Structure formats: C-alpha cells, structure tokens
Ligand SMILES: O=C(N[C@H]1COC(=O)[C@@H](NC(=O)c2cccc(O)c2O)COC(=O)[C@@H](NC(=O)c2cccc(O)c2O)COC1=O)c1cccc(O)c1O
Ligand SMILES: O=C(N[C@H]1COC(=O)[C@@H](NC(=O)c2cccc(O)c2O)COC(=O)[C@@H](NC(=O)c2cccc(O)c2O)COC1=O)c1cccc(O)c1O
C-alpha cells in the first residue's frame with residue numbers, strides 16, 4: 001500500500017499514517033510547488049502585500065491567480081504564528097529551512113499540532129523540489145506530469161533560442177541599495193539556467209559565502225565593492241526584476257565599466273521569478289524565448 005510511508009528529514013525519519021488532506025505551508029515559497037501539483041494546501045504563510053515580489057495578499061506573483069481561484073487562506077504576514085497554523089487544523093505542516101519565509105524557530109511548537117517537516121529549497125532544482133513534495137503528499141503522478149509539460153517546452157525552447165554571450169551572471173538587484181544577491185549554481189535559478197545550456201560566471205576571490213551550520217546555499221551577497229566585482233559575466237540576468245531594474249543597471253555610474261553593461265547584455269526576467277516552481281519556470285522559458293528566439 002501507499003500509506004503509511006516514512007519520510008526522512010534533517011530531523012530524522014517520520015511516519016505519515018495516511019495521505020495528508022489539509023496541508024499548511026509556513027513557507028510562501030513552498031506553497032507554489034504545492035499548488036503546482038494540486039496538493040491540498042489549505043493555508044500559507046505570506047510576505048508583505050504589494051512588496052516587490054508579492055501580490056495584494058502577500059502571495060508570490062506567479063501563482064497569485066491560482067491561489068485566488070482556490071481560496072487559499074493566509075496564515076499571517078511576515079511574522080510566523082503557531083496559533084494561526086493550529087486554527088487551520090492541519091494534518092501536515094511544512095517549514096522551509098532557509099530564507100525570509102523560514103518558520104524554523106517554531107519547529108517544536110508546530111510539531112505538537114501535526115506531523116511537521118523541514119524542506120530545503122535553496123539547494124535543489126524546482127523539479128527536484130517538486131518531486132520531493134510529490135512523495136510527501138502522494139501526488140507523484142502530478143509532479144511527473146508538470147515536469148513532463150516543462151520538458152516538452154524545454155526541448156522546443158533549446159531549439160528555438162540563440163544564447164547571449166557566456167558566461168553569465170544571475171542576480172536579484174536592489175536598485176536604491178546598490179546591492180545584489182548572486183544566484184549560485186546550486187540554486188534553483190542557477191540549475192535552471194544550466195539546464196537551458198548557460199554557463200554561470202565564476203567569482204573572484206574574497207567572494208565566497210559561508211554556508212556552514214545549515215546556512216543557505218542559494219545566494220552570495222554582493223554589497224559595496226562586491227557589486228561591480230560580482231557582476232562579471234558577459235551577460236547579466238535579473239530575476240525578480242523587470243525593465244526598470246535592467247535600465248537602472250544600465251544607468252548606474254558604479255557599473256558603467258562592466259561588459260554586460262557596455263555590450264547591452266543586461267536582461268530582466270520578470271518580477272514573478274523570485275522563486276522557481278512549475279509556474280515561474282514556465283514563465284522564465286517564455287521570457288527567454290521572447291528575448292532570444294533565433295528569428296528575432
Ligand atoms: O532582509 C531580508 N529581506 C529584505 C531585503 O531583501 C531584499 O531587498 C530582496 N531580496 C533578495 O534580493 C533575495 C535574493 C535571493 C533570495 C532571497 O531570499 C532574497 O531575499 C528583495 O526582497 C524583498 O523584496 C522581500 N522579500 C520577500 O518578500 C521574501 C518572501 C519569501 C522568502 C524570502 O527569503 C523573501 O525575501 C521583502 O524582503 C526584504 O526586502 C532578509 C534577511 C535574511 C534572509 C532573507 O531571505 C531575507 O529576505
Ligand atoms: O526598493 C525599495 N526600497 C529600497 C530603499 O529603501 C530603504 O533603503 C530602507 N527602507 C526605508 O527607507 C523605508 C522607508 C519608508 C517605508 C518603507 O517601506 C521603507 O522600506 C531600508 O530597506 C531595505 O534596505 C531593503 N528592504 C527591506 O529590507 C525590507 C524588509 C521588510 C519590509 C520592507 O518594507 C523592506 O523594505 C531593500 O530595499 C530598498 O533598499 C522598495 C521597493 C518595493 C517595496 C518596498 O517596501 C521597498 O522598500
């Protein structure tokens with residue numbers, strides 16, 4: 001039989017007696033993947049409504065419409081609340097290990113309400129994460145279907161586009177802060193670009209970020225002099241940004257000497273690409289096609 005089944009965490013192996021039917025996600029990031037495979041996620045943590053990466057509820061933009069259609073409940077905005085979770089009467093609770101949406105501090109408390117699992121999204125492809133969530137929820141078939149849909153579009157996409165100059169740097173840029181976070185090869189963003197045939201730029205020395213003690217594997221912070229130093233690719237991709245962000249880079253005196261700037265190879269991928277799940281991955285495909293189709 002399919003249930004019960006054991007799922008192993010960083011906190012050991014746990015028993016899911018039966019298929020979850022009321023999943024609460026304390027990670028707004030994880031929620032996108034849950035929705036993509038039609039898992040019964042009935043409530044989610046949210047970030048700040050109408051901020052750079054979220055909709056009017058604090059949900060991530062790429063699955064905003066889906067959450068509204070399904071009447072997804074919002075647990076809280078920003079600060080995690082164990083009582084809010086309890087009130088949803090979950091039979092499974094998910095927590096992200098890293099990121100601003102991690103409710104890891106409430107692990108012990110949440111653990112008393114329902115079986116509770118800790119998931120990393122900082123160190124694996126969106127497909128890997130989807131597959132893992134499929135095992136957790138009993139929606140393996142759905143996860144495989146979503147991945148197959150993408151694989152078909154990818155096979156066509158790789159044929160349809162001509163790559164810009166390599167290697168490339170992928171970031172999230174914060175214009176008024178004159179800073180960026182640089183996506184690593186391990187990050188979902190990095191793995192996706194590699195899958196599409198891109199080579200990520202190697203970093204200078206002094207650039208390397210501790211990821212001991214379970215610290216995140218997805219980004220390297222670029223503040224101060226590290227900004228110009230870290231944007232060293234021949235092309236530059238801005239996730240979670242659109243044209244005004246690319247134009248801000250093109251106009252920044254601090255960055256004027258960089259090759260991606262001087263060769264006009266700075267590309268915005270969209271505000272809905274802060275986190276990668278099936279929905280935003282498909283968007284990234286479409287955008288790369290719009291930018292790089294041979295015939296353009
Ligand atoms: O100080 C922290 N945020 C700031 C400052 O961080 C930022 O300026 C940007 N941010 C990254 O570039 C980033 C690139 C790659 C990965 C990132 O996570 C980025 O944050 C944009 O983030 C934001 O727009 C918002 N962001 C989310 O809603 C979010 C939703 C779900 C999950 C999140 O992690 C979110 O940020 C609001 O957050 C913030 O602005 C902060 C500290 C410690 C660890 C954090 O993760 C922080 O975010
Ligand atoms: O680009 C925007 N800002 C700039 C310029 O804003 C600011 O420099 C500061 N901040 C205010 O001055 C502010 C005064 C009055 C009101 C403010 O909201 C201020 O933030 C510091 O904020 C931060 O550095 C970062 N950000 C958070 O960590 C955050 C974490 C939790 C919650 C936050 O709001 C955060 O900003 C990066 O943000 C930016 O630097 C920007 C865009 C879209 C929506 C935004 O909210 C932005 O601020």
Ligand SMILES: [Fe+3]
Pocket residue numbers: 099100101
């Ligand atoms: Fe964050």
